Symmetry: D3
């Protein structure tokens, strides 16, 4: 019922790609990218929920452009869907070319968080609303992802129990 804009809890992270973050080929390790994604996303989720949160799942990570040593990265995270106690966080990862001022989308990720109280049970969260067109796009496309995620949870119980 109480609502927050997607911008209210929007978090940023600017990082330079150092040799330690890459492979022998000068390409950023996917694991490192995902670690950063998880960090920034968790912070956005805490901001939105105004509470501690736990990562329920990584719903996807798409690697669109290779990231090279010395690149400057901008991570942008915001909530695109608010369930009863849960939040979908969308993270955009862009390559920032400072010499000719271009921004290129290098990766895209969706994660799901659950808000938890002192006691550790699911806490209700505020809803969310977009204010500009990009925000509007992620918001409008949230339902498809939520449906698909539910089906995939079904399949996961089948698999876990088989094991």
């Amino acid at each position: 019922r109480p609502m927050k804009s997607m911008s209210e809890s929007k978090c940023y992270k600017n990082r330079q790609v150092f040799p330690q973050d890459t492979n022998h080929h000068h390409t950023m390790f996917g694991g490192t990218l995902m670690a950063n994604i998880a960090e920034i996303a968790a912070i956005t989720a805490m901001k939105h929920a105004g509470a501690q949160v736990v990562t329920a799942s990584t719903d996807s990570v798409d690697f669109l452009k290779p990231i090279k040593t010395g690149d400057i990265l901008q991570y942008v995270a915001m909530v695109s869907y608010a369930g009863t106690s849960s939040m979908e966080v969308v993270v955009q990862i862009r390559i920032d070319d400072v010499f000719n001022n271009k921004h290129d989308l290098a990766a895209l990720s969706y994660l799901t968080f659950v808000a938890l109280d002192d006691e550790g049970k699911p806490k209700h969260v505020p809803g969310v609303y977009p204010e500009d067109d990009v925000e509007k796009w992620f918001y409008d496309t949230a339902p498809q992802r939520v449906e698909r995620r539910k089906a995939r949870r079904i399949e996961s119980k089948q698999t876990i129990e088989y094991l």
Copy 2:
């Protein structure tokens, strides 16, 4: 048409959960788990392809049970589906209780890799087959995941194109 068992390229990783891998709650940071997952899965994909690989996508990571400091983790990675040039890798993450000989499934992840030749174009990979019941389960359930992953890639393209315009 050349084939490999899921066992042939199966890779293991045993790690203990140390304070540096944890958050304020003593729980393992999700990012660290995902980094290790990516690492072990890439190696499995290389073994199978007998070639260099690139991560196309993380199809999912399900966090099923929380992991505490001092837990012993076993990551198992194997190929569950082999397309023409692509591989689905499944990673099981288990908590190994050595005091009570149990393994409990703590996380489950699916990633997609593309094999590349020296020039960097997509390379054909061998097909894959299961030998035991668990391998059989992951192998049999792979097609559903592949169909859904294709639909999701279509929508992802829609989103990318939209951000390109806007």
Copy 3:
């Protein structure tokens, strides 16, 4: 400095949670980790502003004002507060972000100086800088005294170097 940029144009952010690895024995953030992050974010702001590769000439100061504990959420904000011919003062604010009551407290404050370099590695001219809001105004207005101070300190350092060189 005739071409100009606002302090906002090159403003960089960094949101990070304080994990055990970032701490020391006392649950406090190690100063070194803080300074490493500060260096990274400031270097990026300087690159954005200069539109060129940069080198860190000096860390002019880091003031630790409020202790930072594990589980705190930090927000690093970096921006250019002064632009010489080829050099830039970057100011970094480090705030403790309380998400439970939506407050911010300034935990640390840092000033660094960068030089822009062209492909030869020679000093490159940079755009000047101007403030748009009151905080930006504060740092911009107080920058000249810090710059004067940095220029004196450059001399003192060259000397410590020669004195140690002879002996």
Copy 4:
């Protein structure tokens, strides 16, 4: 006698690729990084065998047999090759794995000693160990001489400590 465990039962694996951060300037793996990974995998194997918390008593040796380059894929295999009353010798084999030609070469070899501890921090009896194949048999058969040298080295180490306490 006592309960026994096969060398295979507590066998632990670790597959890791050699990335720039794990390297020295030469593009060769840093010895320290290798020893860290070795110690890590070895402790887990020892824990599995003892079914208890363990402490590292000593690294008995690390032999660097083949240089390791960036992009090499390593397989660490760890197993208990000797079990004393409360102690375990763990042997770690480090192999370079070549996917292109499907061959394995022994790049390093290490022997460590662990002591099992119960909740009190007292030495706990551990199960004995037995081999099932030729490789396991080899490390098992060659264990006594190594255990002997570790013991002598414990003696002289005592000598060194006592000498240094005096001076």
Copy 5:
């Protein structure tokens, strides 16, 4: 109670590995400053004989670029001792082992406060120089201390202004 600058003098020899560098094959500054902070904290603990906290980094001057595979020697000592506070100076040298050379690659000044168990400021011993370089750092300390006190005052003004 007094101590010489040498009594608490600490050393640290470290090699510059790829993980410590930037894209330029040059040492990442942040890493340098982390090492500086660490060794300085140790020297401060030895002088104070107590727990310390970093009050400020007063300066870090990057004088020569540092490369991968270079060997660094960090030297830290107390150059000024106030009532409860200590200035630590850190010299960072590139140690050329092929022909016994030392080149000063970086120079840093940090200020620490000693804290007793209550977490309150603890009195520390004063300090005295014994050789020419120790004397140099000692004698030139007052300018740095005055600078530090003024800068703390201005930091308080900034905190006040940012609060509103």
Copy 6:
């Protein structure tokens, strides 16, 4: 041509932080071994006046467990100089600043080979002790070196057995 054990002696003071510890608040053995390798490699380079490679870790003895917040002092020196090879001994002490005490927490012996530009074995200067402790490591070194060479034979047998 000769060098004293002190000439190439290297120091390292480091504090034990949570990230360097296992679950019991105790320092991870692996981290210790990494630091030992680093400092020993530097000492070997100074003595040899050349690039070096680690041939073997001859031993690491953990004598005292190391806890969070402890200050460690690593001391490395050459205790033996062969034709092209060097034994380096590393002492790891716990530095108590409250009681001006040093307790030996760990002890390690390593072997290095000096390499020329192309990576062929290079002759190194010999080594000599000047005080009693240096003399002790020097005098006890030959027995350890014989042990190392023998262990190379045993390793040779093991590698060849694995080849079949």
